[PDB]
RNA sequence: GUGGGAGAGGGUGGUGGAAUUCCCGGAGUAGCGGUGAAAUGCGCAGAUACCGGGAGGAACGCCGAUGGCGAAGGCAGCCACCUGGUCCACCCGUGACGCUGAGGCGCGAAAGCGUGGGGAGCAAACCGGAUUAGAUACCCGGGUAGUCCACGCCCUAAACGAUGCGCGCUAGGUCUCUGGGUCUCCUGGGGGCCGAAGCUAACGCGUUAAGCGCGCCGCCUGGGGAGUACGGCCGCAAGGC
């Protein structure tokens, strides 16, 4: 499921290798701090593989969440 | 002997029991309740009905302190989690927000054989 | 590691003539460079076996090339050995 | 001589004098390890996704330098000696890899 | 050789967050835990549940796959350094320098051994609670070696694709990872599935052969006795060949 929208088609042309950019990268994380799978991100093998790295980088810098609390329920 | 009137409700639900801690906005416990606080003893503590009784008991104990609105935090998977939520829904308390905080490791520690085939 | 200028230096050093890249002398020279550097890396880091395999392979290659060289031209072989200080 | 990016996070509660002191120490230690500074970006204090050292926010610097490899780790270690310094991340530079082209 | 690429390939040093345990403090009180049901156990010397701080060890959630790398064993947080292999493009250099490989040498999961550290969680043995006709077990509560690190041994395995290595030749289709190009597609390298010819006792295999051939190595010759005895070599021992 979850075919409603994809993250790659949502935004424009952006650098995947830039870990300092929160606004772009936040879109690739889920409701929780988790990194969205391929079907959600719309990325490719290599792209996704790079995104993971730069996201983890940003996480170390305190820019991105490692995890979050889930609301609603 | 406080008069808080706004606070937090922590539901901790395992398959063996359901225990509810109601606290002030800083997280310090005011009252608490469990399957065993109510008359139940054995496996019957892990029951949804028992969770309803626990939630209601904790809630009335809280309203005795003058509690009105709470923020609910849920930890653990088990029967009676959603029934505790459902009881707190209208206990007379107003549930503001519900949140699942259930703690999960990044694969730190080796689980017991019962919980294995994982890490 | 090995930069471009070092490699070029030794290549132009051991060449049989200007323009020569892949003649036996140059190959033995390069292999000697890498072998020496790798052995230095393995004096420390004694626990790294996967690189040591690489070393074995390089040495084997060098030995085969030299064996071929002495089979063909003994003079160039004596020269190459005296120059690189291999075998003794 | 390789091109690296130095990331530094400081205490957001720092006044001007102590902050100027910290940046002075950073510059000094940078040049002491033989790093020429190609460029610098001061992003100021920003919000953190999780509290670092009990603080909800932090002061972000950025540097792009060219330095000898052998000294790199030491440089990082040096920057960690300061108490006011929170995070230091030294990253090898890379050509930007885009998407939707 | 030149230019370019992907990667959990290896070694050293750093560093991050989640969680568990213990300790300190706050708030709070009658149970918690656990099972099919229970009991042991822990808790008024204040536990469980909740908040804040500290200490310490081990493993890295999402990404993550039907994926990648490595000769195999095997390799997964992030950062840097040191280092091995490999692929493509150019068609530049050498000019058969090739293949295989008894013995030797090296590497070799887990368990195990030696000396010294470390020890959160887990846990052979063990100590208990249950279940049972019994229960030296399955289930529950504890728990030592060990699991972790350094150095040195040990040499095994369903060490498995149960398929030795290299080269040439013999329809395609479909999905996939990674290069290049006149980039819907074509052309290399790798991983999968269905299938031509053919092979096979069958199942199946089928350009990643188990097909057609060539070279070199290892191995088999009914079952039990038995991987036993004896001898030899290796090992501190267990034991291995
Ligand atoms: K075998
Ligand atoms: K002996
Ligand atoms: Mg129970
Ligand atoms: Mg495009
Ligand atoms: Mg690696
Ligand atoms: Mg306490
Ligand atoms: Mg008392
Ligand atoms: Mg300790
Ligand atoms: Mg391979
Ligand atoms: Mg395997
Ligand atoms: Mg390389
Ligand atoms: Mg030519
Ligand atoms: Mg010629
Ligand atoms: Mg051979
Ligand atoms: Mg071993
Ligand atoms: Mg071991
Ligand atoms: Mg030992
Ligand atoms: Mg047990
Ligand atoms: Mg235990
Ligand atoms: Mg002992
Ligand atoms: Mg297998
Ligand atoms: Mg195919
Ligand atoms: Mg193929
Ligand atoms: Mg292919
Ligand atoms: Mg047929
Ligand atoms: Mg087939
Ligand atoms: Mg017989
Ligand atoms: Mg017989
Ligand atoms: Mg037998
Ligand atoms: Mg045996
Ligand atoms: Mg055997």
From Swiss-Prot, chain A:
- Protein name (record): Small ribosomal subunit protein bS18
Keywords, A to Z, come to: Ribonucleoprotein, Ribosomal protein, RNA-binding, rRNA-binding
Gene Ontology terms: biological process: translation
Function description = Located on the back of the platform of the 30S subunit where it stabilizes the close packing of several RNA helices of the 16S rRNA. Forms part of the Shine-Dalgarno cleft in the 70S ribosome, where it probably interacts with the Shine-Dalgarno helix.
Gene transcribed to yield this protein = rpsR
Recorded GO CC terms: ribonucleoprotein complex; ribosome
**What organism is this sequence from?**
Thermus thermophilus (strain ATCC 27634 / DSM 579 / HB8)
Spell out the subunit comment: Part of the 30S ribosomal subunit. Forms a tight heterodimer with protein bS6, also interacts with protein uS11. Binds to the C-terminus of IF3 and to the central section of Era.
User: GO: which molecular function terms?
Assistant: small ribosomal subunit rRNA binding; structural constituent of ribosome
Instruction: Name the family the entry cites.
Output: Belongs to the bacterial ribosomal protein bS18 family.
Swiss-Prot record, chain B:
- Tell me the protein family, please: Belongs to the universal ribosomal protein uS11 family.
What does the record give as the function of this protein?
A: Located on the upper part of the platform of the 30S subunit, where it bridges several disparate RNA helices of the 16S rRNA. Forms part of the Shine-Dalgarno cleft in the 70S ribosome, where it interacts both with the Shine-Dalgarno helix and mRNA.
Q: Biological process GO terms, please?
A: translation
Q: Which GO terms describe its cellular component?
A: ribonucleoprotein complex; ribosome
List, as start-end ranges, the regions of compositional bias called Basic residues.
109-119
- Quaternary structure and interacting proteins, as annotated: Part of the 30S ribosomal subunit. Interacts with proteins S7 and S18. Binds to the C-terminus of IF-3; however exactly how IF-3 interacts with the 30S subunit is unclear. May contact the C-terminus of Era.
What is the designated name of this protein? Small ribosomal subunit protein uS11
Q: Which UniProt keywords apply?
A: Ribonucleoprotein, Ribosomal protein, RNA-binding, rRNA-binding
Task: List the gene name.
Answer: rpsK
An example of a GO molecular function for this protein is: structural constituent of ribosome
Q: What NCBIfam families does its record include?
A: PRK05309.1, uS11_bact
Region spans: Disordered: 99-119
Query: Which Gene3D superfamilies does the annotation name?
Result: Ribosomal protein S11
Q: HAMAP family in the record, alphabetically?
A: Ribosomal_uS11
Curated annotation (Swiss-Prot), chain C:
Keywords (alphabetical) are: Ribonucleoprotein, Ribosomal protein, RNA-binding, rRNA-binding
Q: Please tell me whether the keyword RNA-binding is annotated for this protein.
A: yes
Please give one Gene Ontology molecular function term for this protein: rRNA binding
Which GO biological process categories is it annotated with? translation
Entry's InterPro entries? Ribosomal_uS15, Ribosomal_uS15_bac-type, uS15_NS1_RNA-bd_sf
Cellular component aspect of the GO annotation: cytosolic small ribosomal subunit
Query: Assembly state and interactors?
Result: Part of the 30S ribosomal subunit. Forms a bridge to the 50S subunit in the 70S ribosome, contacting the 23S rRNA.
Q: Output the NCBIfam families linked to this UniProt entry.
A: S15_bact
Query: According to its UniProt record, which protein family does this protein belong to?
Result: Belongs to the universal ribosomal protein uS15 family.
Function of the molecule: One of the primary rRNA binding proteins, it binds directly to 16S rRNA where it helps nucleate assembly of the platform of the 30S subunit by binding and bridging several RNA helices of the 16S rRNA.
Kindly give the HAMAP family that the UniProt entry links to this protein: Ribosomal_uS15_B
Q: What is this protein called?
A: Small ribosomal subunit protein uS15
Swiss-Prot record, chain D:
Listed GO CC annotations = cytoplasm; ribonucleoprotein complex; ribosome
Q: Which GO terms describe its molecular function?
A: small ribosomal subunit rRNA binding; structural constituent of ribosome
Q: Name one GO biological process term.
A: translation
Do the record's keywords include Phosphoprotein?
no
Q: Which UniProt keywords apply?
A: Ribonucleoprotein, Ribosomal protein, RNA-binding, rRNA-binding
Spell out the InterPro entries in the cross-references. Answer: Ribosomal_bS6, Ribosomal_bS6_CS, Ribosomal_bS6_sf, Ribosomal_S6_plastid/chlpt, Transl_elong_EF1B/ribsomal_bS6
Function text: Located on the outer edge of the platform on the body of the 30S subunit.
Quaternary organization: Part of the 30S ribosomal subunit. Forms a tight heterodimer with protein bS18. May make transient contacts with protein uL2 of the 50S subunit during translation.
User: What is the similarity comment for this entry?
Assistant: Belongs to the bacterial ribosomal protein bS6 family.
For this entry, the protein name equals Small ribosomal subunit protein bS6
């Amino acid at each position: 499921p979850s075919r409603k929208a994809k993250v790659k088609a949502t935004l424009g042309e952006f650098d995947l290798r830039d870990y300092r950019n929160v606004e772009v990268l936040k879109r690739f994380l889920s409701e929780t701090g988790k990194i969205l799978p391929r079907r959600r991100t719309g990325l490719s093998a290599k792209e996704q593989r790079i995104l993971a790295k730069t996201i983890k980088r940003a996480r170390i810098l305190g820019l991105l969440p490692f995890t979050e609390k889930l609301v609603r329920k | 002997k406080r008069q808080v009137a706004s606070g937090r409700a922590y539901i901790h639900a395992s398959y063996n029991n359901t225990i509810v801690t109601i606290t002030d906005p800083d997280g310090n416990p005011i009252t608490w309740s469990s399957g065993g606080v109510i008359g139940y003893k054995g496996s019957r503590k892990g029951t949804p009905y028992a969770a309803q009784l626990a939630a209601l008991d904790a809630a009335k104990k809280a309203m005795a302190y003058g509690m009105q609105s709470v923020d609910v935090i849920v930890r653990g998977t088990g029967a009676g989690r959603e029934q505790a939520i459902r009881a707190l829904q209208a206990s007379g308390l107003q549930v503001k927000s519900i949140v699942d905080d259930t703690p999960v490791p990044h694969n730190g520690c080796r689980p017991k054989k019962k919980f294995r085939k994982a890490s | 590691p090995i930069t471009k200028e070092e490699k070029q230096k030794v290549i132009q050093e051991f060449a049989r003539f200007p323009g020569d890249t892949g003649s036996t002398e140059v190959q033995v020279a390069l292999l000697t460079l890498r072998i020496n550097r790798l052995s230095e890396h393995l004096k420390v880091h004694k626990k790294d076996h996967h690189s040591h395999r690489g070393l074995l392979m390089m040495v084997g290659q060098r030995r085969r090339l030299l064996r071929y060289l002495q089979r063909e031209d003994p003079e160039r072989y004596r020269a190459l050995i005296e120059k690189l200080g291999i075998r003794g | 001589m390789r091109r690296y990016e130095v990331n530094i996070v400081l205490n957001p509660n720092l006044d001007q004098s102590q902050l100027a002191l910290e940046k002075e120490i950073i510059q000094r230690a940078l040049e002491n390890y033989g790093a020429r500074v190609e460029k610098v970006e001061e992003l100021g204090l920003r919000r953190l996704a999780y509290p670092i050292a009990k603080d909800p926010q932090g002061y972000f610097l950025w540097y792009q330098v060219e330095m000898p490899e052998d000294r790199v780790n030491d440089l990082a270690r040096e920057l960690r000696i300061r108490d006011n310094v929170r995070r230091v991340m030294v990253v090898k530079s890379q050509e930007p890899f885009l998407a939707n082209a």
